[PDB]
Amino acid sequence: QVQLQESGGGSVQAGGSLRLSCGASEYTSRMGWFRQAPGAEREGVACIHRQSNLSYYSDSVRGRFTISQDNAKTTAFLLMSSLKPEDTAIYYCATTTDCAAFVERATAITAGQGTQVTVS
Amino acid sequence: DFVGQTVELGELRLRVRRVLAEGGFAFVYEAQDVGSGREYALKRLLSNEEEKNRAIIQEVCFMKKLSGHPNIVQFCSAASIGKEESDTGQAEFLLLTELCKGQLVEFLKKMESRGPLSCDTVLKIFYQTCRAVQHMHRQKPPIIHRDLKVENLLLSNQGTIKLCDFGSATTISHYPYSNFPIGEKQDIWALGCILYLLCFRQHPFSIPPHDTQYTVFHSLIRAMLQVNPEERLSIAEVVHQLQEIAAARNVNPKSPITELLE
Numbered sequence: 300q301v302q303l304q305e306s307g308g309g310s311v312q313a314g315g316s317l318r319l320s321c322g323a324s325e326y327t328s329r330m331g332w333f334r335q336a337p338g339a340e341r342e343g344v345a346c347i348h349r350q351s352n353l354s355y356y357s358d359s360v361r362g363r364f365t366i367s368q369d370n371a372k373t374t375a376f377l378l379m380s381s382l383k384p385e386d387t388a389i390y391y392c393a394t395t396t397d398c399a400a401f402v403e404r405a406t407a408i409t410a411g412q413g414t415q416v417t418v419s
Numbered sequence: 420d421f422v423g424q425t426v427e428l429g430e431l432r433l434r435v436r437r438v439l440a441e442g443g444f445a446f447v448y449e450a451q452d453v454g455s456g457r458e459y460a461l462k463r464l465l466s467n468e469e470e471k472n473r474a475i476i477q478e479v480c481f482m483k484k485l486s487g488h489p490n491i492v493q494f495c496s497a498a499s500i501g502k503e504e505s506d507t508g509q510a511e512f513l514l515l516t517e518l519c520k521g522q523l524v525e526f527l528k529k530m531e532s533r534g535p536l537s538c539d540t541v542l543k544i545f546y547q548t549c550r551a552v553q554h555m556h557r558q559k560p561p562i563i564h565r566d567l568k569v570e571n572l573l574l575s576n577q578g579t580i581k582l583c584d585f586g587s588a589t590t591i592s593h594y595p596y597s598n599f600p601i602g603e604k605q606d607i608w609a610l611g612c613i614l615y616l617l618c619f620r621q622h623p624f625s626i627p628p629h630d631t632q633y634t635v636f637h638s639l640i641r642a643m644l645q646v647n648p649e650e651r652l653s654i655a656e657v658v659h660q661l662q663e664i665a666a667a668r669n670v671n672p673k674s675p676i677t678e679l680l681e
């Protein structure tokens with residue numbers, strides 16, 4: 300498997316921003332985050348296709364979250380802006396075969412340990 | 420000499436008006452319900468081998484399974500004529516569908532005197548095509564088309580794209596544990612060729628270096644023409660991107676391509 304190293308997140312005020320990063324031990328084609336809010340289903344939040352830079356978001360974070368990557372295609376970043384109580388959750392880095400199904404179903408090959416995000 | 424005759428597909432009885440396309444094993448004709456007045460497309464496939472019987476029945480089964488979708492030709496009914504009754508001496512299969520207005524390329528040919536296609540027009544054409552293919556890949560198990568090309572897209576009377584030509588399509592039978600790729604990604608490579616063709620009016624087998632018109636489509640073209648099938652996008656990856664492009668441009672990409680109606 301690939302090893303995923305996560306950082307960023309934490310606590311923030313409503314309307315504020317945080318940034319997560321995730322570094323993979325090898326190249327993979329697609330990387331993103333899913334989350335799990337209290338009592339809720341796993342929800343795919345953002346995903347990036349490395350070779351094209353095409354980026355995929357759930358409707359719940361569209362226009363507020365931005366996923367990007369480095370030139371070495373080892374790392375992805377998630378900027379989370381205009382945060383709100385609904386975004387409180389554990390956020391898990393993941394690799395996937397399909398960004399679109401990832402956003403729809405949180406379907407992943409491998410997942411990280413998770414970073415707590417708490418809004419307000 | 421099939422033109423002129425009357426044929427019966429159950430309740431329906433109808434008249435063969437003219438040829439629309441000839442070809443190898445098959446011919447396509449315009450046909451009219453002699454009682455109800457409504458018009459139809461009629462494909463007539465000839466078989467002198469059990470092998471061909473199997474391929475033809477399979478095509479009919481795919482047409483039936485995929486009917487109901489706004490970008491797939493509507494199945495109406497099918498029938499057979501035994502070797503004993505036919506004017507050919509071979510078995511004959513008859514497939515009845517809704518009648519589209521004609522072939523997409525003929526309408527594009529009319530308009531290419533009038534300059535490159537606008538991005539909105541490309542967007543509608545390509546999205547409606549991709550939605551037909553998405554309906555196929557979402558079947559359980561998925562149905563792979565294997566013959567996607569711009570020549571076998573039709574334009575409906577409503578001015579929408581209609582996908583047909585299921586004679587090369589395949590799937591897995593007796594499907595009860597998996598989602599391995601089984602061919603979906605060859606259809607995507609083919610769709611990338613279509614998007615390229617619609618923008619730059621040439622088959623890809625390089626995006627022009629300074630294109631400022633279709634730049635919005637460049638990343639998606641490259642991602643569909645990815646050599647590695649794992650890297651290559653899925654149909655859901657393509658459709659999702661097309662939806663966001665349409666929203667940004669304030670286009671309803673399922674809507675009639677009114678410009679093509681002239």
Ligand SMILES: COc1cc(-c2cnc3c(N4CCOCC4)snc3c2)ccc1N
Pocket residue numbers: 439440447460461462492514516517518519520521522573583584
């Ligand atoms: C109305 O004039 C045309 C109609 C067609 C045409 C060809 N095939 C059709 C259809 N098919 C149904 C599937 O069986 C073969 C193709 S459905 N509507 C069609 C219309 C092609 C060219 C012209 N000029």
